[PDB]
Structure 1
Amino acid sequence: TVGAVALDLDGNLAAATSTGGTTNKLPGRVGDSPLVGAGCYANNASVAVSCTGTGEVFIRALAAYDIAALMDYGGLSLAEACERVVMEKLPALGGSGGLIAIDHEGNVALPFNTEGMYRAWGYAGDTPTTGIYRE
C-alpha cells in the first residue's frame, strides 16, 4: 500500500491510497484501500487520512472515518484520535499497520503500531522529514 494526504493553500484536504493488497490473497479479495472511510477519507471540516496494513481490520473498524468521527463528535485532537485508533482499537481486533493524517488546522500525524512505515512529510516551502523505523 501507498498513500498521500495534503492541505493546499486554499484550505482543501484530500487523500489517496493505492495497493497490490496482501501477498497470497485469494483472487477477488478486496482490502480497505478502495473503501471510502476504511483506507481513504478526506473532509475539509475534519481530516484527510490514508491507511496501510491488515486491510480486513481497517474495514471492520472503519479506521479512516473513525479518526474523523473521534475528532468531529468526540472533540479529540488529531494526536489523540490517531493514538486511540492505531495504538488501542486496531490492535484489540488483531490489526496492525498505520496511517498518515492532516487535519483542517494543518496538524500532521504518522502513527504506526508496526516495526516500520515508509513515510515522509513537510510543510510547503520547508525541509521534508523521511522515516522508515520508529521515533
Structure 2
Amino acid sequence: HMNPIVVVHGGGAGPISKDRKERVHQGMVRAATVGYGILREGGSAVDAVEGAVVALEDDPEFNAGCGSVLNTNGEVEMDASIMDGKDLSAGAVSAVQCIANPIKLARLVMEKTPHCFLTDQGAAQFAAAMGVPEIPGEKLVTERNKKRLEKEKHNLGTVGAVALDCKGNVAYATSTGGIVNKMVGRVGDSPCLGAGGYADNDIGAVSTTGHGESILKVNLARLTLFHIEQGKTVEEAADLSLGYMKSRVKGLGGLIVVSKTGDWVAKWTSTSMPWAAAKDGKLHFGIDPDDTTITDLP
C-alpha cells in the first residue's frame, strides 16, 4: 500500500513582500499538516484535500472563503471544485456567497445530489437545504481586500490541494474568490473539471492556479495529465502544459501534481507560488524558485 502524499498551493501570483511571506508560510504549513494528519490516520484522499482547502479557506491570508478578493461591486463570490480519482466523482460550485467554506459545499454537491455543478442562487438554496450556515458577507470581507479593489479601480492567493492516499486513491480540491474587480457572476477555472483540477486513479491528480481564463482555454489540469499518460515525468508534464499555456494564450499560472505512483511536483511560470508538500514524515515548502526547505513533521 502506497505512502500517502499531499501537496497544497496558494496562489500563482507576482512578487510577495517579506511580511506576507511568513504569514503565507504558517497557513500553508497548517494546511499541509491538516491534510497529512488526515492521510496518516488512514483517511481518504478526498477527505485530505477537503481538509487542506478548508484550512486555507478559513485563513484570511488566502484568496478563498474569508479573505476572498472582491468583485466589481465590493462583494465576495467564490468558486470551488473537488474530484475523487476512483470513480471520477466530482462536485463544484460557482458564484457562491455568504458561506464560510465553498469547498465543503462542492463536496455536498458530489455526494448529496445527482449533479456535479451548482451555481449562484441554486448553490445558495442547496446549501440552505443541507444546513450550511448563511453568514453576513462582511465576515468574508477583509480590509486588505477593500484596499486592493478600491485601487484596482483607479492573480494571487488562490488555493488547492492534491493527495494520494494509502489505498491508492487520488483527489484534488480547488477554491477561490476569483480575480479582484471581476464582473458580477464571473466564473473562473476553479470549479471547472479539467481546468481547475482533475483527478484520476489511473493517472494522477492536478490542481491549478493563475489566470483562470487561460487555464480554461487550454484545460490546463487535464492537459498536464495527458502528458503523464504519454509517459512524461510529472515535472516534464507540468513544464510542457504550463509551457503551452504561455505560448498559445499568453497566460501564466502554476500547478501541483501527484502521480498514481506517488511522484509529485509544484511548477509555475508566474513569479511566485506558495506551496507545501508532505510525504515520508517530511514537510517540503517554497514560494520562489528553489527557495525550497525540507523540515521534519513531528
After TM superposition, the score normalised by the length of structure 2 is 0.43
Counterpart code for 2:213:
E
Partners of 1:12 and 1:47 lie apart in 2 by: 9
Partner SS state of residue 232, structure 2? coil
Alignment of 1:1-135 (within 5 A): 1-72=158-229, 74-86=230-242, 88-92=243-247, 93-123=249-279, 125-135=280-290
Percent same amino acid at aligned positions?
40
SS in 2 for 1:3: strand
Q: How many residues were matched structurally?
A: 132
SS of the residue aligned with 1:100? Answer: strand
Q: Alignment partner of 2:267: what SS? A: coil
1:47 is displaced (CA, Å) by 1.3
Measure, in 1, the Cα distance between the counterparts of 2:174 and 2:266: 15
CA distance in 1, matches of 2:271, 2:205: 24
CA–CA distance in structure 1, aligned partners of residues 231 and 288 of structure 2: 30
- Structure 1: unaligned runs, 5 residues or longer: none
Q: Which has the higher contact order (CA 8 A, sep 6+)?
A: 2
2:186 counterpart letter in structure 1: R
TM-score of the pair, normalised by structure 1: 0.94
Distance (whole Å) between structure 2 residues aligned to residue 94 and residue 35 of structure 1: 20
Larger radius of gyration: 2
Q: What SS does structure 1 have at the residue aligned with 2:282?
A: coil
The alpha-carbon deviation at position 95 of structure 1 amounts to 0.7
Shift of 1:55: 0.3
Displacement of 1:75 after TM fit? 2.2
CA–CA separation in structure 2 for the residues paired with 1:130 and 1:70: 25
CA drift at 1:57 = 0.5
Mapped to 1, the partners of 2:180 and 2:245 lie a distance apart of 20
In structure 2, runs of 5+ residues without a counterpart are 1-157, 291-298
By percentage of residues, which structure has more strand? 1
SS of the residue corresponding to residue 38 of structure 1 reads: coil
Aligned equivalents of 2:271 and 2:223: distance in 1? 23
Whose helix fraction is larger, Structure 1's or Structure 2's? 2
Deviation at 1:2, TM superposition (A): 0.2
CA RMSD of aligned residues (A): 0.9
Q: Which runs of 4+ in 1 moved over 4 A?
A: none
**2:281 is paired with a residue of what secondary structure?**
coil
Q: Match of 1:102, SS?
A: strand
The one-letter code sitting in structure 2 at the alignment partner of 1:78 is V
For 2:167, give the aligned amino acid. Answer: D
Report the CA distance between 1:129 and its aligned residue: 1.3
